Design a protein around this nucleic acid. Structure first.
Ligand SMILES: [Mg+2]
Ligand SMILES: [Mg+2]
Lengths: 130, 196, 173, 104, 118, 51, 162
RNA sequence: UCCGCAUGAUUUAUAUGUAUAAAAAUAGAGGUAGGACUUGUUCCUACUCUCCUGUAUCGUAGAAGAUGGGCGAUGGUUGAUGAAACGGAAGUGUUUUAUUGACUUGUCCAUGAAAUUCCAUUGAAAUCUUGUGCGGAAUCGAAUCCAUUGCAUACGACUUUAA
RNA sequence: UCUAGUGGGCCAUUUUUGGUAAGCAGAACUGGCGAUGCGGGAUGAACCGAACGUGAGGUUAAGGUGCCGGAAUGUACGCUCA
């Protein structure tokens, strides 16, 4: 289903830009592609395909479109919201939140999970009562 | 980060030597290892070439007394054990103790079929061999060099898979009722803000 | 890591000719020392001059004017095989002339076992027109509707859980 | 009463191909898989806990303590020095890495 | 007499004295034309050499920092009147039991430590 | 005299014993306070980009 | 023979910033190991902690700055606490060099209120009474201080945020 | 020899939560009640859940975890028995039922832990043999030598017989 | 100034002559072994690295880092099926 093409949106996995959204704007060869992102601290760059994973978002982008055109068409479409409203991005966001919990927060999660367990076991048994 | 006492490895689909080197290192670190389904191991290269390698091994016998000679074990788990032994300093006490902490078997006999079985990604054929590269299965190599139990293992494995499917079906149903009683809980909102 | 340098040098002036001519080369070398050495290597086979009787008057690293623009680079080389000498032409897609040159050296090492010492780069040019591209594998990359699946890598598991010896499940593509 | 240390394995002495240096032990720490993550455990107290047959002060538990000195290689192994050099029969035996000299 | 370090506590036994009862343990320099010990091949026994000499400050000192002075009579013990913190009295083996008592008493009067009391 | 060598690059007191000027030494002077012209030239750039 | 006079002046310790008074800390060693306590003040080498006695049973005591983990939990207001009395002399054992006889039968007297003097159970209650209002304000704090810290399977301290 | 009233010691303990059983493919259905019907090489139904492997999930608060309560469901954990059912590849394990103990932190208070007054440690419980008071009687063997055989044999060994 | 041992050498690089060739014989140059341990080349007098008092710490050479075995089942681009 997923293919390398101009306009295909990618998620960078290796390197200093790990976990950032980007769009293929030009295909240099079968190993590398020039990518871009409206984000200010993300620079237009050539990246190897092994450093990114393909998302399912494919943008209507012309080959070789510059930074200004990419940013405009990215906002014209819903790409930032389109990626974020997905099970993939939601699972990564949950992982990012989970990485930053301090000891107090881990204690809070444990307490809440204890409460959920009691309700879950009760609700299971009552369903079985019918 | 696997420091558990005993690990059970599903040998199906693993490359012989790569799995052997990982297991041998684990044994030397003090891990007890069980390797199950040794008949489903793979060796890269086409069948004829790997068959010839065993036949050349089978020629090596003590000229003046073959009962002293190299003992050529034919069963798949013995072929794996030989690979592991070759990667251990087995003539030392440390190597012998490492080797004794390995248990390699054909099929999945009853102690282990109710236990969790893991894989070793560094040794998986689908990850390591280029598609279209010919490879052989150890059970087939073993059966043509004198191993006698391909059929009984296969029949017992089909019976085990039927029971495991029944066990899995029962566990699927139980987890569904728990998940329904979980997503309907009011405490899900405060768990969301923590990433749970 | 190769870099491109322009090197300008000349015969040291003598009484016979007090205005020797200035000769320039573009050279791909890992540093300035190698660049100057390569300059004298190529100048010795054309002009009656050595390092002892010549001098370098300038050396400048040349960066790529458009490192963000994918290009086609045609490289003419002369190389020594085990049996003879040949000239050959190769084409590479890259964003820098340095990147193409590094691709060429790796390519000659892989396909002909040609070492660095056995290769002379005659010329590196950015090919502008589609039809001037002589290799089909290169001009198929100039198609606007170019599409292909991700190449077969050995999957990817972060950096840390890829260091885990044991996995609970078999991978899924 | 629960665990306040990280699990570790005593792998080998520091060595070349044929020469061993038992004054330094190579220790693999569970969950520590790079030389950068090994920096956290540098200086941490590490212990070898074992049972003998003769009680001392009513106890048959014996401990040999040490300290993590430096990372070893690329994969999170560390070098450790113990007050008494660890016996070679403990290769592959468990160790405990504490948090005791804490900077967090 | 402070921080006494021994560079080595093993004694340097003669090569092959472990294999032949006729070959005494006392050190002999191997002079064989093929000797692996003389050539210092790896894994062979060490040979005594001057690098093993101990710190000049602590050389000859017993663990307590004193040096064991042999005494054969009371007047030998009296030699250690001023040198009470540097020398200990070692009573000779061939001194009689009567004279030994008089020596132990004289040392105790002078505060001279006796290595072999009893 | 002199039982232990001390590296002046680490021991600041020793670096003061040698080199009395270190106290007044001023590194990181700003000299680009002006308009900063560009010195490349037409001939230089056409030679630079040949071939 | 007299030694030289060393050139080694005694300068104050600089504790890390994470150990500010009011920080919740996890104890790593000793009989109260694993306990979350509350930092009252910074002594020279140690932290005067309480981790209120009524909440988890840890009394006013010192702890070396190396043998704690400073949690980033919300700070507990210790502003209104008289911490200028907890000196080194306050925590110091009575000098037992010399006229002593180490044996058994002294555990019976050295343990209960037969050993704990007055004004030590009194100021313990005083600092506690000034800390419970701040602890009660933050939800889960009292349960958090009562619970013991432990490492579970999969925990990697070099990666965990504390 | 079995239980027993209970004395010592060992190890599960290479412990320190050392908890987690589908199967199969990888240019694929990975399958997740997988949904959706008629149980079929068909759904356009559920289509972005897939790809983050487990950084997951399950457990995890209380003198090594004490002593008393107000609320809230009507559940959860463990232990002893019941009658069992299913387990043969090495089943020695998995599941359920009736009586009866113990706990429950689902939520909220009260009492208590200190001087072990700055780390140098292990916490209890059961599980199997052994010293012993024995009530309760004992349900109970064999092999070998010396003999014998000749289907055997240098000697042992072997096949027989036997009180 | 007096005196010892020695007056069978051998190996390698490079230049050679004789020989069909040789783990052959004879010469040239330097480095070696003999009299040289140590790290490396699985092994090995001479090859690579390096020449050694007893030790602590650090860093290297030559050579390595799937397991035996200390050290990336590292990264990049290709080639190759026996
Ligand atoms: Mg000695
Ligand atoms: Mg290793």
């Amino acid at each position: 289903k997923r293919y390398v093409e101009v306009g295909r949106v990618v998620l960078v996995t290796k390197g200093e830009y790990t976990g950032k959204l980007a769009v293929i704007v030009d295909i240099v060869d079968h190993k590398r592609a020039l990518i871009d992102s409206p984000c200010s601290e993300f620079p237009r760059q050539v990246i190897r395909y092994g450093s990114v994973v393909l998302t399912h978002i494919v943008m209507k982008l012309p080959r070789g479109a510059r930074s200004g055109i990419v940013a405009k068409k990215w906002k014209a479409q819903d790409v930032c919201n389109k990626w974020a409203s997905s099970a993939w991005a939601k699972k990564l966001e949950a992982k990012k939140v989970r990485s930053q919990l301090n000891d107090f927060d881990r204690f809070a999660v444990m307490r809440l999970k204890k409460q959920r367990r009691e309700q879950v076991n009760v609700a299971v048994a009552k369903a079985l009562k019918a | 980060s696997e420091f558990q006492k005993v690990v059970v490895i599903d040998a199906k689909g693993h490359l012989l030597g790569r799995l052997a080197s990982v297991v041998a290192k684990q044994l030397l670190g003090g891990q007890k290892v069980v390797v199950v389904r040794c008949e489903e191991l793979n060796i890269s290269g086409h069948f004829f070439r790997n068959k010839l390698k065993y036949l050349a091994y089978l020629r090596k016998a003590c000229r003046y007394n073959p009962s002293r000679g190299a003992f050529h074990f034919r069963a798949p788990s013995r072929i794996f054990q030989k690979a592991v032994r070759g990667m251990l300093p087995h003539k030392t006490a440390r190597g012998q103790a490492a080797l004794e902490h390995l248990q390699a078997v054909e099929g999945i006999p009853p102690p282990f079929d109710k236990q969790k079985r893991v894989v070793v990604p560094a040794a998986l054929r689908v990850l390591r061999l280029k598609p279209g590269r010919k490879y052989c299965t150890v059970g087939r190599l073993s059966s043509e060099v004198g191993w006698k139990y391909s059929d009984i293992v296969s029949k017992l494995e089909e019976r085990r898979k039927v029971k495991s499917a029944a066990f899995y079906q029962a566990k699927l149903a139980k987890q569904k009722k728990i998940a329904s009683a979980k997503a309907a809980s009011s405490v899900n909102g405060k768990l969301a803000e923590f990433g749970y | 890591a190769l870099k491109e340098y322009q090197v300008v040098g000349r015969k040291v002036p003598t009484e016979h000719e007090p205005v020797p001519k200035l000769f320039r080369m573009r050279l791909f070398a890992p540093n300035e020392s190698v660049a100057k050495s390569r300059y004298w290597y190529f100048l010795k086979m054309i002009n009656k001059v050595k390092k002892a009787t010549g001098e370098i008057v300038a050396i400048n690293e040349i960066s790529e004017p458009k490192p963000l623009k994918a290009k086609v680079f045609g490289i003419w080389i002369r190389y020594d095989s085990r049996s003879g000498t040949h000239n050959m032409y190769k084409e590479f897609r890259d964003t820098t002339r340095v990147g193409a040159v590094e691709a060429m050296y790796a390519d000659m090492a892989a396909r002909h076992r040609a070492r660095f010492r056995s290769i002379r780069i005659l010329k590196v040019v950015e090919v502008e027109k589609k039809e001037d591209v002589r290799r089909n594998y290169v001009k198929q990359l100039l198609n606007p509707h170019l599409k292909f699946p991700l190449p077969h890598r050995r999957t990817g598991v972060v950096g840390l859980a890829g260091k885990k010896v044991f996995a609970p499940h078999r991978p899924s593509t | 009463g629960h665990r306040l240390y990280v699990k570790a394995k005593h792998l080998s002495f520091q060595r070349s191909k044929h020469v061993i240096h038992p004054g330094t032990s190579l220790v693999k720490i569970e969950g520590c898989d790079s030389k950068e993550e090994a920096q956290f455990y540098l200086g941490k107290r590490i212990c070898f806990v074992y049972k003998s047959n003769k009680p001392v002060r009513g106890s048959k538990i014996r401990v040999i303590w040490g300290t993590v000195s430096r990372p070893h290689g690329n994969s999170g192994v560390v070098r450790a020095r113990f007050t008494h050099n660890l016996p070679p029969k403990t290769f592959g035996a468990s160790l405990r890495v504490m948090l005791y000299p804490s900077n967090v | 007499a402070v921080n006494i370090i021994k560079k080595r506590t093993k004694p340097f036994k003669r090569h092959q004295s472990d294999r032949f009862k006729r070959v005494g343990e006392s050190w002999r320099k191997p002079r064989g034309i093929d000797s692996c010990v003389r050539r210092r091949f790896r894994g062979t026994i060490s040979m005594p050499k001057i690098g093993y000499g101990n710190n000049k400050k602590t050389r000859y000192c017993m663990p307590n920092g004193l040096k064991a002075f042999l005494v054969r009579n009371v007047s030998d013990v009296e030699l250690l009147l001023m040198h009470n913190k540097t020398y200990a009295a070692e009573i000779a083996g061939n001194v009689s039991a009567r004279k030994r008592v008089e020596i132990v008493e004289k040392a105790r009067a002078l505060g001279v430590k006796v290595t072999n009391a009893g | 005299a002199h039982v232990q060598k001390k590296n002046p690059l680490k021991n600041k007191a020793v670096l003061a014993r040698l080199n009395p000027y270190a106290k007044a030494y001023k590194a990181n002077v700003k000299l680009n306070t002006g308009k900063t012209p560009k010195a490349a030239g037409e001939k230089f750039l056409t030679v630079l980009h040949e071939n | 023979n007299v030694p030289k006079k060393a050139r080694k002046a005694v300068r104050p310790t600089k504790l890390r910033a994470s150990l500010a008074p009011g920080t919740v800390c996890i104890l790593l060693a000793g009989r109260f190991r694993g306990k979350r306590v509350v930092v009252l003040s910074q002594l020279e080498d140690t932290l005067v902690v309480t981790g209120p006695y009524k909440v988890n049973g840890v009394p006013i005591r010192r702890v070396n700055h190396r043998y704690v983990i400073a949690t980033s939990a919300p700070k507990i207001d210790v502003s209104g606490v008289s911490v200028e009395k907890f000196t080194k002399a306050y925590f110091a054992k009575q000098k037992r060099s010399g006229p002593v006889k180490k044996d058994e039968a002294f555990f019976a007297e050295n343990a209960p209120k037969n050993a704990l003097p007055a004004e030590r159970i009194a100021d313990q209650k005083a600092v506690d009474a000034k800390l419970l209002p701040a602890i009660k304000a933050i939800p889960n704090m009292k349960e958090y201080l009562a619970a013991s810290f432990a490492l579970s399977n999969g925990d990697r301290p070099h990666l965990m945020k504390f």
